[PDB]
RNA sequence: UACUAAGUGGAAAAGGAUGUGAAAGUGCUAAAACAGCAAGGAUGUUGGCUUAGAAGCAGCCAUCGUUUAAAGAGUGCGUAA
RNA sequence: ACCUCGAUGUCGACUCAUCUCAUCCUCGAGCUGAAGCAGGUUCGAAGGGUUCGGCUGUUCGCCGAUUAAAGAGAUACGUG
């Protein structure tokens, strides 16, 4: 099934949400009213379909590696692991992680902490 | 190309050439290194084509060495002339290379592609190429 | 592999003829030629060959001359 | 269709058959479809 | 190597004689021939509902007929049971295909449609105008029908304009 | 390998006469995202998930000293959730990965060492 | 005695092709292994150079970890993604 | 510097054309970066056909004018 990633409000990026069953504002609203803690930074969810739609979805954490850059304490955008994106924390990478680790396919914390360290290597750093 | 300084005599003649065993044994510098399976007298047109060839199919991370020369002259003759009136024009430098002479030796490049490179020099050679490793 | 190639002293319609169309029109000529094939250019040569009574069938008409019933002579 | 005198795997799936005493590649996609190798 | 499986064998009326040159396969959909060469490359053999044809020599050619016959051993089987059934894709904005008795016509590029006979046993149906489903018996006749109407113009390889196999591919280049 | 045959058949032998208390529950087309469920649920206990060889597991299961030849044999792509450590949690693990599956059956096992089918299993393994 | 499916012998060469018989080591395996066959082919996967729609492959990069026997920013095919 | 000078008549043309097909066409399809109406390549194909004139004298070489086609060469660089 499509995959997307939204923001706190908008919802412009791909017309995989149209295809889920539903006119756009009214499962717009109901986007921004669940993810209105999450406000200002963007969100991966899964979309699962549904005839009317009055409520099919979850809510995938926010995506490391774009994450990654909270818990580096600033918003560089990179592509290649050479160039290095600031300094990770480790209280805000263990926050990550187990915010993370829904999202993960595990339940434990070390390997939420590890596969952030996976993918946060896309940027230029691993988790220390 | 490879045009000598000198050469110790203006046309040497088309000498004849003995011996299974004379001159570059195996691949002083490289890893690789090309065999010609037919020993006679070569050209250094063709020297450049194969190595040419083996950069072109090398790029620049993989090293050539060339370790012969064509030292003495041969002619090759035109048209509309009558035999005779002394040995004909020396049109090419000319190496006698006897069979056992390692001439180009490759390095710094995966074997297979070392291999393939062989092959391809061999390609653009009247000769047949062979694969010699490095003993020192 | 074996077709059969033929030209006489015409020109302009050179004979090849593959074995199944061999089959089709004419049979007797390929076994006179073969034999033939191995006579010396003499006196006798088409003298000889005409022994070579070349048929397609288990018959003859010479049945009347007294043959001899046997196999690969 | 063709001629040369080796043939090679050409595409992604480009076959090596020996067609008639001919060596040939050919490709699921017509494209890649050599003679005489 | 296929050449040795269990290949199932049908009670109802397929049974399978092996000749020194040929094997026949018997069941309610007529009967399928295979012609052997003249050496047997396989052992033959049937078990009670069963059959694994070993090959009895090992040389270039028979191995490879092994396999080819024991592949064949076993689409006989299940087409003289059951038959067996190609499709034909005759995609284009104006190529529309119909079946009149046993005979298919078919309207490509041209404005004058064409007509082809069909092998008996071999029955053709349409269920939309660019399909032909022929379901037979032997996939070797259906195979030779639908060549013989494919190698006269092939479907364009930019957009289907003509009869696919549905196991042939084209590629899409520049102009529209 | 041979004397991989043997070693499997010795350890899951071990491990299914020691813990006789598991479920080899089985899922042919064992997914991804089914995995991933299971053993978020799981995780917290000994228990994993695997596609095993039939042939070892059914020779193990006959060398367990627990019912079944065929019973832990030939079927699909046969997966296994052997039941480790506590088979409570595990069990729920394997009802949510059930839940989960399109279809998914009661291949074999016992809760705590005590005979239990789909219709028993379930009852407390809920 | 083979070898052939070319009539090679009675045309080859630069070179190519699982050509074959034979030779030579090879793990699985008769608890059915490998490739068709049941297959998962996921997650961070929307990660970025970034585009209402390149975000998982017009193209590129770190292509690594996580569930695990196993899943590659996907090998590829393919969606405007 | 050879079979050929005690000779072996050749340039070109007209006519006769034939032949091998490394094809121009026809016939046939593939491949097609072939959008179709037409087809670029490739081979099979000798089976047939495969321009007239003014001008260097002449087919040919310039120019004008033709069909689907106005062939890659030999026949003592065909012919006497």
Redesign the pocket.
């Known amino acids: 099934i499509?995959?997307?990633?939204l923001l706190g409000g908008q919802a412009?990026?791909?017309?995989?949400l149209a295809?889920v069953g539903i006119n756009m504002g009214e499962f717009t609203k109901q986007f921004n009213e669940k993810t209105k803690d999450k406000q200002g930074e963007?969100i991966?969810c899964?979309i699962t379909a549904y005839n009317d739609k009055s409520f099919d979805f979850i809510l995938?954490?926010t995506?490391?590696?774009?994450?990654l850059k909270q818990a580096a304490k600033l918003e560089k955008?990179?592509?290649?692991?050479?160039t290095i994106v600031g300094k990770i924390t480790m209280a805000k990478a263990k926050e990550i992680a187990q915010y993370?680790l829904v999202?993960?396919?595990?339940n434990?914390v070390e390997?939420?902490l590890?596969?952030?360290?996976?993918?946060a290597?896309?940027?230029?750093i691993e988790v220390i | 190309m490879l045009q000598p300084k000198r050469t110790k005599y203006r046309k040497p003649h088309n000498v004849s050439y003995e011996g299974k065993a004379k001159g570059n044994s195996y691949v002083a510098f490289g890893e690789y290194g090309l065999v010609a399976t037919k020993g006679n007298w070569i050209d250094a047109r063709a020297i450049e084509s194969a190595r040419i060839a083996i950069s072109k199919c090398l790029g620049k991370t993989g090293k050539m060495w060339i370790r012969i020369f064509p030292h003495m002259s041969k002619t090759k003759k035109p048209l509309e002339v009558?035999?005779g009136s002394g040995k004909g024009n020396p049109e090419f430098w000319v190496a006698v290379v006897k069979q056992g002479t390692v001439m180009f030796e490759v390095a710094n490049i995966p074997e297979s592609q070392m291999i393939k490179a062989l092959?391809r020099a061999?390609?653009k050679?009247?000769?047949?190429?062979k694969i010699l490793k490095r003993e020192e | 592999?074996?077709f059969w190639y033929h030209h006489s002293q015409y020109?302009?319609?050179?004979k090849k003829v593959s074995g199944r169309d061999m089959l089709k029109k004419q049979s007797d000529k390929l076994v006179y030629n073969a034999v033939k094939g191995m006579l010396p250019d003499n006196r006798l040569s088409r003298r000889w060959i005409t022994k070579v009574h070349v048929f397609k069938g288990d018959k003859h008409n010479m049945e009347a001359q007294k043959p001899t019933t046997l196999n690969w002579s | 269709?063709?001629?040369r005198?080796?043939?090679?795997p050409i595409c992604?799936d480009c076959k090596?058959?020996?067609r008639?005493?001919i060596?040939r590649v050919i490709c699921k996609?017509?494209?890649?479809?050599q003679?005489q190798? | 190597k296929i050449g040795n499986r269990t290949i199932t064998l049908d009670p109802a009326k397929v049974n399978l004689n092996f000749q020194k040159d040929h094997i026949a396969v018997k069941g309610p959909l007529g009967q399928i021939e295979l012609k052997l060469p003249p050496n047997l490359p396989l052992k033959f053999e049937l078990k009670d509902n069963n059959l694994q044809i070993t090959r009895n020599n090992?040389?270039?050619?028979?191995?490879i007929f092994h396999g080819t016959y024991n592949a064949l051993i076993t689409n006989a089987i299940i087409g003289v049971t059951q038959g067996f059934e190609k499709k034909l894709r005759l995609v284009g904005v104006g190529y529309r295909a119909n079946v009149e008795g046993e005979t298919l016509n078919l309207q490509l590029?041209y404005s004058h449609p064409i007509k082809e006979k069909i092998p008996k046993g071999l029955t053709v149906k349409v269920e939309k105008n660019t399909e032909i489903t022929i379901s037979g018996i032997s996939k070797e006749l259906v195979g030779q029908f639908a060549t013989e109407v494919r190698?006269?113009?092939?479907?364009?390889?930019?957009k289907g304009k003509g009869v696919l196999y549905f196991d042939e591919v084209?590629?899409?280049?520049?102009?529209? | 390998?041979?004397?991989?045959?043997?070693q499997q058949?010795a350890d899951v032998s071990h491990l299914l006469s020691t813990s006789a208390g598991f479920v080899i529950f089985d899922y042919?087309?064992?997914?991804?995202?089914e995995?991933?469920s299971?053993?978020?649920k799981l995780?917290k206990n000994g228990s994993?998930?695997?596609?095993?060889?039939?042939?070892?597991l059914?020779?193990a299961l006959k060398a367990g000293k627990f019912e079944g030849i065929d019973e832990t044999a030939?079927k699909?792509?046969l997966?296994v959730a052997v039941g480790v450590n506590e088979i409570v949690e595990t069990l729920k693990a394997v009802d949510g990965v059930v839940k989960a599956k399109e279809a998914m059956n009661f291949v074999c096992g016992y809760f705590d060492n005590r005979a239990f089918n789909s219709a028993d299993l379930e009852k407390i393994a809920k």
């Open positions: 499509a995959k997307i990633n412009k990026p791909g017309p995989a295809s963007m991966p899964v995938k954490t995506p490391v590696s774009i994450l955008g990179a592509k290649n692991a050479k993370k999202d993960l396919n595990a434990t390997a939420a590890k596969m952030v360290l996976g993918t290597k896309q940027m230029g | 009558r035999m092959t061999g390609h050679l009247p000769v047949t190429w | 592999n074996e020109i302009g319609g050179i | 269709m063709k001629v005198a080796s043939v090679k992604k090596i058959i020996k008639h005493q060596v996609t017509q494209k890649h479809k003679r190798g | 090992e040389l270039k050619q028979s191995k590029g190698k006269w113009r092939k479907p364009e390889p930019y084209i590629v899409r280049k520049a102009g529209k | 390998a041979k004397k991989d045959k043997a058949v042919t087309s064992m997914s991804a995202i995995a991933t299971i053993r978020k995780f994993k998930i695997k596609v095993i060889k039939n042939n070892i059914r020779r030939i699909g792509k997966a």
